[PDB]
Every structure is written in structure tokens, then in C-alpha cells.
Amino acid sequence: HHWGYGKHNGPEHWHKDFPIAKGERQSPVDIDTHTAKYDPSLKPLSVSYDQATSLRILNNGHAFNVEFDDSQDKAVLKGGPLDGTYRLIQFHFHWGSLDGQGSEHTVDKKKYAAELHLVHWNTKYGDFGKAVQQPDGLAVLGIFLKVGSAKPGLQKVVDVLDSIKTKGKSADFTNFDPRGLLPESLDYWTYPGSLTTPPLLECVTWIVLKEPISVSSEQVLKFRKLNFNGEGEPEELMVDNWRPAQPLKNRQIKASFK
Ligand SMILES: COCCCN1C=C(N)c2cc(S(N)(=O)=O)sc2S1(=O)=O
Ligand SMILES: [Hg+2]
Ligand SMILES: [Zn+2]
Numbered sequence: 001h002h003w004g005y006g007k008h009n010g011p012e013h014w015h016k017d018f019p020i021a022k023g024e025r026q027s028p029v030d031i032d033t034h035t036a037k038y039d040p041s042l043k044p045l046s047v048s049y050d051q052a053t054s055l056r057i058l059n060n061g062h063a064f065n066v067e068f069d070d071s072q073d074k075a076v077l078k079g080g081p082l083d084g085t086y087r088l089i090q091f092h093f094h095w096g097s098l099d100g101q102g103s104e105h106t107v108d109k110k111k112y113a114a115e116l117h118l119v120h121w122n123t124k125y126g127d128f129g130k131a132v133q134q135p136d137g138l139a140v141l142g143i144f145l146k147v148g149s150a151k152p153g154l155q156k157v158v159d160v161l162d163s164i165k166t167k168g169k170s171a172d173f174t175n176f177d178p179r180g181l182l183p184e185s186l187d188y189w190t191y192p193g194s195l196t197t198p199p200l201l202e203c204v205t206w207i208v209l210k211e212p213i214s215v216s217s218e219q220v221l222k223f224r225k226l227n228f229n230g231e232g233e234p235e236e237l238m239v240d241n242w243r244p245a246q247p248l249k250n251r252q253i254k255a256s257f258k
Contacts, residue, residue, distance in 0.1 A: 003198045004228060011243045018198045025202045026246035027193030028104035031253050036189055039254040045186045045207065046079035052088060054176035057160055061167035061228055062197060063092040063241050066157065066176060070128070075178065077120045077139055080207055081190045081254065086120035086139040089128055091178060093117070095223045097239035099147045104196050104242045105208050112144035112212055113220055116181060138204040143183060148214035153180020158222045167230035183211040187257040196243045210257060
């Protein structure tokens with residue numbers, strides 16, 4: 001059956017239809033801060049989200065995605081461990097049913113309440129479709145969310161959630177500024193990995209920021225009221241839409257900070 005996060009179609013079952021699930025560079029992974037290699041050759045990240053053009057927000061049955069117009073170099077990510085320019089195409093979150101879980105990546109086994117993923121594709125390849133067939137096609141900027149004070153930049157997103165409660169629903173979501181979701185520091189960990197959801201394609205250069213952003217419990221609570229199910233179907237709360245940590249195998253997590 002189509003994949004999900006439940007007992008019968010969750011992560012532990014993905015390998016059956018997506019054999020790459022047991023591959024060599026699978027994500028997420030536990031970032032062991034004591035084994036991560038500080039690397040001085042890593043340039044600082046260059047986040048140019050000033051001309052970002054958000055188009056809409058959609059509930060796809062696995063999470064809610066905010067999509068952006070990537071027809072041109074509007075919102076891009078450069079520098080860091082990247083060669084070339086990567087265009088922002090969408091961002092989504094993974095969250096849990098309780099504040100002590102939700103993130104996909106963990107830091108020294110610590111799970112955060114949620115994790116924001118800003119998906120970018122390598123312009124060198126022409127289009128998103130070609131990028132996903134390439135061993136450096138995607139760059140996903142991951143940001144952890146911890147329950148504390150409210151994140152004002154996240155409110156516009158929280159306010160529209162009622163309109164996309166169920167699978168398949170979408171709502172116009174223009175003029176959203178993704179910069180309001182960035183933490184203060186751009187320090188990060190980076191490693192070669194994959195999409196954390198099927199098709200689990202292996203070509204994401206993961207860039208996980210060190211500093212998490214704070215969101216109120218009320219803000220994360222609204223995430224938890226979404227539905228995996230489409231309208232008319234039995235209600236299944238959208239929570240715990242995260243993949244557990246995969247074995248690091250033959251990889252090293254580089255750090256841009258000491
Ligand atoms: C062949 O088409 C593949 C399409 C993959 N896309 C959908 C996934 N759910 C997905 C998961 C992503 S994540 N969470 O690992 O960054 S990104 C992302 S995605 O690159 O925007
Ligand atoms: Hg790939
Ligand atoms: Zn994700």
C-alpha cells in the first residue's frame with residue numbers, strides 16, 4: 001500500500017518497495033557531536049531568500065509543503081559544502097505527537113520537537129526531475145524546532161493550517177518570507193545522505209543547522225491537528241511523520257564550527 005508512518009506502512013516497511021532504504025547513504029542519522037569532524041575548508045552558507053516567491057501550501061498526506069516558484073534564481077542556497085547554485089523549491093516539517101520527539105536527525109541521540117526541511121535542487125541539472133537522478137542533485141537545509149517562545153515568522157503558516165486539514169487540500173500562500181524561519185547562527189553539520197521519505201533517493205547533501213529555532217507549544221500543537229487522511233475518510237492525526245536515524249556507515253559528518 002502507499003507508504004506512511006503507521007505500524008503497517010511505516011519506515012520499517014519502506015524497504016520492500018524502495019530497496020534503497022537499506023542503502024549506503026540513508027538519512028536521517030544521529031549527529032554524534034564528538035565524532036563530527038570540524039572542517040576549516042567549509043565555506044559559510046549563503047542563503048539568498050530575499051526574492052523568494054511562495055506559491056501555495058499543500059497537505060500531501062505525509063506533511064504540509066509550502067511550495068515556491070523555482071523557475072528562476074529567486075531563492076537560492078550557495079556556499080557551505082555546495083558547488084554551484086541550488087534553488088528553493090519547497091519546505092516542510094516533521095513533528096511528533098509529544099514535544100520530546102519529532103525531529104528526524106538527532107544530536108547525540110537527543111530528539112527535537114520538530115524539524116524543518118528547506119529543499120533545494122541543483123540548477124546545473126536544468127530541472128528538479130533531473131536533479132533527483134544525480135549524486136548531488138539536492139541540498140536540504142534542516143532546522144530543529146524546540147518548544148519555547150513563539151516564532152513570529154511561523155505564525156502565517158500556523159494560521160493557514162485549518163484550510164489544509166486533510167490530504168490533497170491546498171491554499172494560496174503567496175508572499176511568505178522563509179527568512180523568518182532561520183535561526184540566528186548559520187553554523188552547521190553536513191554529510192551526504194538521502195530523502196528521509198520514499199523514494200529515499202540518495203542525493204541530498206544535508207546541511208543541518210546547529211542552532212534550533214523556538215516555537216511555542218501552541219504553534220506545534222496546531223501541526224498535530226492536521227490529518228494524514230483525505231476528506232471523508234477516517235481521521236488520522238498527522239503526528240510522528242519522521243523516520244528514525246539510519247546507520248551512518250561509511251560516512252563522516254563534517255562541522256563548520258569548532
Ligand atoms: C522523484 O521525485 C522525488 C520527489 C521527492 N520530494 C518529495 C519527498 N517527500 C521529499 C522528502 C524530502 S526530505 N524530507 O528528505 O528532505 S524532500 C523531498 S522532495 O525532493 O520535495
Ligand atoms: Hg540521486
Ligand atoms: Zn523532510
